[PDB]
Amino acid sequence: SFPKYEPSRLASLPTTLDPAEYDISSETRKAQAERLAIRSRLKREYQLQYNDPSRRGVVEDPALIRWTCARSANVYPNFRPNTKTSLLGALFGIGPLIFWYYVFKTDRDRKEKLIQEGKLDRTFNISY
Amino acid sequence: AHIEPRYRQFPQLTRSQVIQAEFFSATMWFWILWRFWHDSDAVLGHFPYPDPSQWTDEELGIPPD
Amino acid sequence: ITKDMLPGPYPKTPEERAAAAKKYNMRVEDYEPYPDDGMGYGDYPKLPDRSQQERDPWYDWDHPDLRLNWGEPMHWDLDMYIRNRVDTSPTPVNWNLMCKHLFGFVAFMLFMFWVGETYPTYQPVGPKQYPYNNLYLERGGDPNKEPEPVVHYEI
Amino acid sequence: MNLFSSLTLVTLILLTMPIAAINFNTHKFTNYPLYVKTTISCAFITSMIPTMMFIHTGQEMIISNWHWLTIQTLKLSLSFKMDFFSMMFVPVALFVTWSIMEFSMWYMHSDPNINQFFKYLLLFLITMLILVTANNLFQLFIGWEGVGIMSFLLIGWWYGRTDANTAALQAILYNRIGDIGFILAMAWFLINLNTWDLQQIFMLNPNDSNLPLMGLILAATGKSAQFGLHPWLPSAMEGPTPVSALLHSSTMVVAGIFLLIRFYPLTENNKFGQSIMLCLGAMTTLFTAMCALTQNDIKKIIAFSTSSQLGLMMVTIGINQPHLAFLHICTHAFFKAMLFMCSGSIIHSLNDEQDIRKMGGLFKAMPFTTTALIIGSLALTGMPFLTGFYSKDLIIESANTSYTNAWALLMTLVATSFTAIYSTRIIFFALLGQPRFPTLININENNPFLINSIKRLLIGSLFAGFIISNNIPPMTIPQMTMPHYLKMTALTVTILGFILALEISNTTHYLKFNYPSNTFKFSNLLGYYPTIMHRLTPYMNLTMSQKSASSLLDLIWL
Amino acid sequence: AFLPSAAYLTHQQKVLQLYKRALRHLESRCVHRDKYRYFACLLRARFDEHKNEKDMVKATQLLREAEKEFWHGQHPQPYIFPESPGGTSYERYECYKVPEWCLDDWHPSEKAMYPDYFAKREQWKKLRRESWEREVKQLQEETPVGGPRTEALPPARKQGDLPPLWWHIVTRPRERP
Amino acid sequence: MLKYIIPTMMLMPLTWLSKNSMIWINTTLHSLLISLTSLLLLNQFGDNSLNFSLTFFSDSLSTPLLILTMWLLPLMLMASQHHLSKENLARKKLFISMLILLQLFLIMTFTATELIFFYIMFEATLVPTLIIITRWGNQTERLNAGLYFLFYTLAGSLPLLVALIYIQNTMGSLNFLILQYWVQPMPNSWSNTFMWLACMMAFMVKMPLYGLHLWLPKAHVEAPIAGSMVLAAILLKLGGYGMMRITLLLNPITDFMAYPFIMLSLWGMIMTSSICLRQTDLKSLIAYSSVSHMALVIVAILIQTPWSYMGATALMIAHGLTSSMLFCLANSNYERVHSRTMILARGLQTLLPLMAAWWLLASLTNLALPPSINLIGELFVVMSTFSWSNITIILMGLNMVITALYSLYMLITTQRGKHTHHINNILPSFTRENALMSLHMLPLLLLSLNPKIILGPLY
Amino acid sequence: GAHLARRYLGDASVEPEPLRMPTFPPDYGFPERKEREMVATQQEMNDAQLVLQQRDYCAHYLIRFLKCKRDSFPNFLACKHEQHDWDYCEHLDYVKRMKEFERERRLLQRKKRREQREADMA
């Protein structure tokens, strides 16, 4: 019939073409009502501090503080050296260093061999 | 007095903007017809493009052997 | 802020998972962490990788430019999925179909320029002819040496 | 002599004087935009005298007036090159900018940061005439990065809007990718030729100049929106209308083309650089003109128009005809600035409406705007003996009659037809037919600022090609002998484009609803190129910028 | 899906939203007004063919393949209104929308430039601060246990009181400063 | 040099005998007078360095770092006086005394005629900086950085000490003037390989090197503003100064010992710049930018051409000014919103237009807008590394894209977009803060007029 | 443009290639062929600062036209006939290039029919 839309990593499926959006069951009513309840409670807890006149400053958001503490602090104490961590720290850790090492060493050996054989046009090359 | 905003109908026009727009449209077609009447070769062609097959073998030096 | 709202290690027991989902302010069923391979995410919730461009714009947001609320557990790459950056939104044409059309179009235009460079078009003329030994002294020839005679003839 | 160099420097110092005025302020201004417009009018009048006394004798010079630095063999001096390119570009740029600022005194009147806007626009003009007059690569890099940064600041003018900041950072990204190649060219000339000055580059005249010309072609790709580094020029329509009119149609975006025209003695002795310029220009002028066929925002359509004209400029450099390319720059400035001004006059009249599907019926509502939009479109397409005829048609008259990549020529002709297609598309959806805009008509254009600002570029778009092409000296030999099917090529292809697009436009009144074709989905989503690479290349950067770079290596292992 | 008041979309709301998005994307496809108006009555007939469908599972399936029809026939760049999200003039003046509390940080030499304005702003702030504790003690006795269920707020009940959480909605910046 | 050391020491009785409301004014005044005095060091010559005594000398490498050092003290006194207002008066004088003592150590670190006096003053600069960072850093969480400082002491300064004592026994002197004329070529041997690592790794960590930069986005974060200013502006540049002195003795083994570390920097500036695109912490973003700019100075010293030394010392002066101004802008928002989170306070051009102008100018100098000396240093290093290898321009130019990308992102996030609603303590800009931004930026802009005084001894 | 089809779709053996031609001697078929006279002196076009592409066998018309263009300032429409003279003689130079091309094509036809006559006869 029709071409079915293919989702991707950078092209998500729409809300309309997802089947689980069309759930009518009461457990989905419970989950949606609890999400609405948590969101309404957090909205109320925010805008009681936001609309307060006696507060003049920053309504601190512990989800934001928790996000920054996860992006900075929680990186080392939850590390475990295993096969996956060591192989991925050896691929992107000492891989491209070795790559550019052999590339630049090859080109510099080529250029040195051409200079000591009188081949490289180093005529007007007096700034270096 | 400015141009009043109007609703669901044709807006007010000034005599001056209409005569200037007609004047520059006449200026465009005047300049086009003028330089087409005087040059007539920048669009069509400056010189004749000769036929290579219509040239004789003596001026080109082709001895038949 | 204090410690029992800060992130911790990977949740193993289900009651630590419940304590974290209460800490991260979300349902326990939605709360899934990153898998404990040792990459250091910790007990942070694995949000399903939706760009903030995808959100409801007409919704009354706490952070309207971010399309984000107060107390909502943010995405791990929230700095990456802002509307100034990486988007994951649905597109009218499929992703692989876009990649196929782009690669076929670009490679076919490259191949057609290679074909036209292989077979160049020109005019039914001879070469352009210049006097004075192909303009020898004009093109940087030395005045002491004398080149071969470049003589052109009438036709 | 003493007149030429003096008024040359007086033009640039006069352009810098309102910057000192706006920086030394205490009062609230007695119409500072009028002051900057008066200053740029007088700077135009000032720069007219060196241009006239260049047309008299051919008088070129260099003003290496201030010694700045000496790195052991490299004497970097403040050096201004007054040649044919500066003498034809400076009056055209000042005339266009003067019309853009008299436009902006009407269009940008509601903006409370109008003095900052005119300040930034003057800063752009100063950096651009630093670019086009520079005699070494360093001062040209100063003007180059200056027009890049003022492009950033004038795209992101409504800095609260997310899309404007996104487009501005996008333009900076693609321009710095071009700057990779510009710095490659500077590095090559400093190492192999011991100079950044143009004179020693041209006098030494190197033969192995493939690598610096590849650097310059990458620089012109980043700057003139060639294919691969193009989409920032359609993205850059998120800035205001006089920004897109002055900067991103006529003045800034020709600077990569100007960089390649500036280095013509290296390109005329390197056939490989000519072939790469020809292929890249034909690819860009095909692709952007094809994308312009199926768009609905009028600023996007005219941005694809100016990028297709830049691709055609790259084509006519690539056939070793640089002076025709620069004549096409000086020609293109007038009618493309006028087309953006008339489109923005429609936009401001129709209460910030830019989508052409809610326009129409403006032939008799906005008569002067309709007149000038038709004249700008006909100058764009190559109507006989408008200004766009005196360069672009000659481009085709040298693109046919030369040792040329054949497919590049065929795509050049397809682009020439597509120009007529999107031009009559603009005239169809925006001027013709019956109205589609909402019901409260506030349509008005009777301000002498708007009318005179479009009027002077209208006089330019009518007469300037004739005047300039009869005032410039020959620098090549014009190829004037060709068969009649080859002389009538560009006109016939343009009229075929008009006929095909009129048939397309008259298929829209029919009461039929067709499913979208794959060509329509390809050209409407911009060859799928800003949809993929703007998602994929950031993704593969930023995860790699977080997972392995920050977290794995530089927080745990190292 | 994601809404402030309801936790979901009703089937009636889904039908109306799909009808509206279909007409908008259709008007994007069908530029001219008489042509769109003809196809708009045709599409209204197509939507009113199965308006009277009692079976909600069958109506669910019909709505699902109607979404597939709408996705197969959508315009790639539909007409977005300029101040609608995705529009060309959208959030353009947000750089001009200064919050009101910045007036508190002015110097008194420029506060004295507008005497009536700040002399009235003092009693605006007075009104806010004597309304705040009354509307807090209003919200604390009406909110159920566990917090409020939905994000909607109750109005001002007594005469003389003000509605709760009102200051940033009333004193918000104009859309064209 | 004794006309500079003695006024810097007289700033100690000036700061301890001053009246309690006058101790910022007096130290700022007399340190600005010392910074005006600091221009007498511009008596340089095209052949000879300015050689004062047996203990102190000044070529055109040490002179601009001295002027920047003596200029940095009044700016640190301006920057650090707000958040010390509720401090005890005696603790405030202790802070000012540690700043003065750090300047005192630095201005005879850069002029050290002999290399072990350079080592003593070089490792003497760490102690007042340590005390400033850990007594006024507003939070101290250094569980991983203790082991890294142990790694700095093991792999760094102690092999340098043993190597300098070895040169003292071999050459008979460590006078740099004598070592200009008594230098022997250091040939290929394993003894000379460990000699090269001992002479270089202390300064490699001080730059910092990529992979060894683990301390710098911690020590910049956990510090007060004066500590971050002196770390970014001067204390990284001790490594580059020491490399440019000690690479005299390391020829010609440097010509094959530079190849690993050059890779570590040429890829490293690709990574850390990219790291700046994913920073939640603004101060950490400026720290990783400092790593991404000192990688070029490492490469330019290791390739040892004239253009590379000229570009490296110009980049050192320019980056000192620029990154010090960036940390001061980060503090001028942190003193209002009380958090370093870069996504917290947005849209600040709607609220602070002149401060957003300062953000714009510091970003344009950060991304090397010509003709600024950031670009002059960047550009000359790029030219010299093109002469080293013609492929490296890619790794240069790609860096010069990403260096632009995070520079404007830092501008776009903090200053542009929509303002944050729940933050209402955003005060207008104090005249102190704008004066601090101008005393950073206006010298940096005036040095574009006359850059020849910051291009080193071989201009 | 038909010769492009003759060289690509046909054979390139009989079509003269653009890059290196004439492949035949200039006296081959021409009894006592004369040279191409240059009218403007080398020093005269040296002082006129002409482009190296413009110093062909008819640059003297260009020198007369540029002297007229300098001397008729500001009346920039007063020297149309000198431009016409230069354009007409450049046209004649292009015609001579066409004559060289047709000469080379007809001598390659002579060689083709010669070897076909030799294959038919011997």
Ligand SMILES: CCCCCCCCCCCCCCCCCC(=O)OC[C@H](COP(=O)([O-])OC[C@H](O)COP(=O)([O-])OC[C@H](COC(=O)CCCCCCCCCCCCCCCCC)OC(=O)CCCCCCCCCCCCCCCCC)OC(=O)CCCCCCCCCCCCCCCCC
């Ligand atoms: C030794 C004597 C020398 C004398 C000559 C002076 C030499 C240079 C000195 C410093 C120049 C900059 C000074 C102003 C900037 C800083 C303050 C500021 O922001 O003020 C805004 C304010 C105006 O704005 P506002 O509306 O009132 O309020 C701010 C707004 O709210 C919000 O602001 P905004 O967004 O509306 O507007 C900000 C705008 C934003 O505009 C931009 O960001 C655009 C800039 C980049 C693109 C354009 C330039 C590109 C490069 C080309 C030009 C340079 C080379 C030219 C040479 C020929 C070609 C090679 O910036 C400007 O307009 C600044 C103009 C000058 C910019 C210089 C380049 C900065 C870019 C980064 C570095 C680039 C390379 C280094 C350049 C070095 C030049 C020497 O200016 C003032 O009030 C002026 C204050 C006094 C200034 C004194 C300057 C001299 C100081 C030195 C003292 C010692 C020597 C004695 C000389 C005394 C002379 C009077």
Ligand SMILES: CCCCCCCCCCCCCCCCCC(=O)OC[C@H](COP(=O)([O-])OCC[N+](C)(C)C)OC(=O)CCCCCCCCCCCCCCCCC
């Ligand atoms: C209203 C303002 C105008 C001033 C009004 C009041 C004064 C009246 C007018 C008369 C002025 C005085 C007489 C003329 C001036 C003095 C002339 C003179 O010899 O001066 C000595 C010199 C001339 O140079 P020099 O060659 O003699 O010496 C150079 C110095 N050494 C050799 C050590 C390197 O300086 C000047 O003239 C300074 C003015 C320069 C003007 C341009 C400045 C541009 C700054 C840009 C910075 C970045 C550059 C990057 C680009 C570099 C190139 C790529």
Ligand SMILES: CCCCCCCCCCCCCCCCCC(=O)OC[C@H](COP(=O)(O)OCCN)OC(=O)CCCCCCCCCCCCCCCCC
């Ligand atoms: C003549 C020779 C021609 C040679 C051609 C081949 C070489 C060049 C190849 C193409 C390189 C450029 C294209 C890829 C990167 C483009 C990134 C970009 O522009 O992102 C834009 C994106 C927003 O775009 P958009 O989706 O339109 O936003 C509006 C609505 N959201 O904005 C964002 O998402 C923000 C992202 C911020 C961070 C960017 C991370 C990626 C950085 C890419 C650097 C590329 C460096 C290349 C170096 C090459 C060296 C040789």
Ligand SMILES: *C(=O)CCCCCCCCCCCCC
């Ligand atoms: C042979 O055909 C010589 C002409 C140049 C090459 C072919 C160009 C074909 C396209 C141009 C003419 C189009 C006429 C509608």
